[PDB]
Design a protein around this nucleic acid. Structure first.
Ligand SMILES: Nc1nc2c(ncn2[C@H]2C[C@H](O)[C@@H](COP(=O)(O)OP(=O)(O)OP(=O)(O)O)O2)c(=O)[nH]1
Ligand SMILES: [Mn+2]
Ligand SMILES: [Mn+2]
Ligand SMILES: [Mn+2]
Ligand SMILES: [Mn+2]
Ligand SMILES: [Mn+2]
Ligand SMILES: [Mn+2]
Ligand SMILES: [Mn+2]
Ligand code: NA
Length: 325
DNA sequence: CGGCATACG
DNA sequence: CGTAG
DNA sequence: GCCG
C-alpha cells in the first residue's frame, strides 16, 4: 500500500465503510479544533481503508499500512471488538461537535466564524436568525436556503442544471463548453452541490465569460444568490409544482489550463491535496489548477489531457471514479 | 524535529 | 474572512 | 497523528 492517496485507486464504494466513517468523524472533529495535522492523518487513514480490496477483520491486517499508528489502530480495534469506539461516540454526541457541524454547513460560515459563535453561546440556526445584523449577505443567503441546501442533489437534478447552464453559456459565447466536475464526475449518485467547468477551444476567447454567463442566468430568474473566474451560486431548480435551491459552482479556464482545472475540480479534495503534496515533495514540481511548474528550469508543463499530467508526475493514470480518496 | 495543497471571491 | 476540489 |  503506497503512502500517498494519488498512488492507489480509491473507488466510491468499498469494503470498510464503517471503519472509514469512524475515522472521518475524528478527522472532522480535529478540524473543528484547528488541528489540521491530526485531521490529515485521520483522513489519510480512512482513505487507506477505502483502497483495501476486502474488509479488515483483525488488527493484524493493519500492520504495515501507512497512516495507522497507535491512535487510529485503537479506533479500529474497538470497532472490531465491540462494534463502537467510545471516543467516536463521545464526539458524535458532543454539543461542540454537533453545533460546529451545523454552523460550518452554512454557506458563508467557516470554522473560525462557527467557533466564535459557539464561544458566544449560540447553538441553533434560529439563534442566528434572531441576530441578523451580524450576518453577511452570503451568510443570510446560506441561512435562508439552509433547509433546501441540506436536501441531497440527485443525478436528475444535475442533468437539468447542465442544460440551463449550457443555454446561458451558448449565448454568452458560442462554442464554449460545459463539463460536469466534482463528485458527480467521480460517479456519485448524490451530492450537496453541482460543479461545472467552462472553457472555449480558442485560447483567450474565454476572457470575460463568467460575468456574461451569470447575467444571463440571472435574467432568466434562475439565480437566487451570487457574489472573475469562479462563481459560487445558489440556483433555483424546478421541482414538481415548485422548486428548490441548489448550490452550483461555475468555473472558467482557458483551454491551455483546462486539463489542470479539470483535474483539480474533479477531486476528491483529499486526492488533490495528496497529489499536490506528492508533486512537490517527491518530484520537486508545483501543481495547482492552472498548471504544473518546474521551479529549477522555471518552466510550465504543457498538458493536453489529465493523462498527460499523471505521466508528467510519474503516476499511473486513475480515472475519476478511482479518485474517491 | 518540520510538514501537512494551493488557489480565487 | 469566505469559497473550491 | 503520523511520516520521513
Ligand atoms: N445545508 C447543508 N449542507 C450540508 C449538509 N450535509 C453536507 N452539507 C454541505 C457541507 C459541505 O460543504 C458539503 C459537502 O458536499 P458533498 O459531500 O457533495 O461534497 P463536495 O461537493 O464538498 O465535494 P465533491 O464535489 O464531491 O468533491 O455539503 C446538510 O445536511 N445541510
Ligand atoms: Mn492519541
Ligand atoms: Mn475492549
Ligand atoms: Mn461538489
Ligand atoms: Mn462545489
Ligand atoms: Mn486564473
Ligand atoms: Mn466541499
Ligand atoms: Mn500533534
Ligand atoms: Na460553510
Amino acid at each position: 500500500m503506497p503512502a500517498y492517496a494519488c498512488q492507489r485507486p480509491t473507488p466510491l464504494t468499498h469494503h470498510n465503510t464503517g471503519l472509514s466513517e469512524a475515522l472521518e468523524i475524528l478527522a472532522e472533529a480535529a478540524g473543528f479544533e484547528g488541528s489540521e495535522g491530526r485531521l490529515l492523518t485521520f483522513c489519510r487513514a480512512a482513505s487507506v481503508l477505502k483502497a483495501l480490496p476486502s474488509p479488515v477483520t483483525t488488527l493484524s491486517q493493519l500492520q504495515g499500512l501507512p497512516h495507522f499508528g497507535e491512535h487510529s489502530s485503537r479506533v479500529v480495534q474497538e470497532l472490531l471488538e465491540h462494534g463502537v469506539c467510545e471516543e467516536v461516540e463521545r464526539v458524535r454526541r458532543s454539543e461542540r461537535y454537533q453545533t460546529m457541524k451545523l454552523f460550518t454547513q452554512i454557506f458563508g460560515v467557516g470554522v473560525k466564524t462557527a467557533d466564535r459563535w459557539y464561544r458566544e453561546g449560540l447553538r441553533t440556526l434560529d439563534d442566528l436568525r434572531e441576530q441578523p445584523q451580524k450576518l453577511t449577505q452570503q451568510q443570510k443567503a446560506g441561512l435562508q436556503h439552509h433547509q433546501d441546501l441540506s436536501t441531497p442533489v440527485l443525478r436528475s437534478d444535475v442533468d437539468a442544471l447542465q442544460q440551463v447552464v449550457e443555454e446561458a453559456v451558448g449565448q454568452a459565447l458560442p462554442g464554449a463548453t460545459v463539463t460536469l466536475t466534482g463528485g458527480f464526475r467521480r460517479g456519485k449518485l448524490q451530492g450537496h452541490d453541482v460543479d461545472f467547468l467552462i472553457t472555449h477551444p480558442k485560447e483567450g476567447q474565454e476572457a470575460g465569460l463568467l460575468p456574461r454567463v451569470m447575467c444571463r442566468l440571472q435574467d432568466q430568474g434562475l439565480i437566487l444568490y451570487h457574489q472573475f473566474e469562479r462563481s459560487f451560486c445558489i440556483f433555483r431548480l424546478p421541482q414538481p409544482g415548485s422548486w428548490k435551491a441548489v448550490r452550483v459552482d461555475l468555473v472558467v479556464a482557458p483551454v491551455s489550463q483546462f486539463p489542470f482545472a479539470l483535474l483539480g475540480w474533479t477531486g476528491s479534495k483529499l486526492f488533490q491535496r495528496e497529489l499536490r503534496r506528492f508533486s512537490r515533495k517527491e518530484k520537486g514540481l508545483w501543481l495547482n489548477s492552472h498548471g504544473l511548474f518546474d521551479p529549477e528550469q522555471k518552466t510550465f508543463f504543457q498538458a493536453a489531457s489529465e493523462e498527460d499530467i499523471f505521466r508528467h508526475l510519474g503516476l499511473e493514470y486513475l480515472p475519476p471514479e478511482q479518485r474517491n480518496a
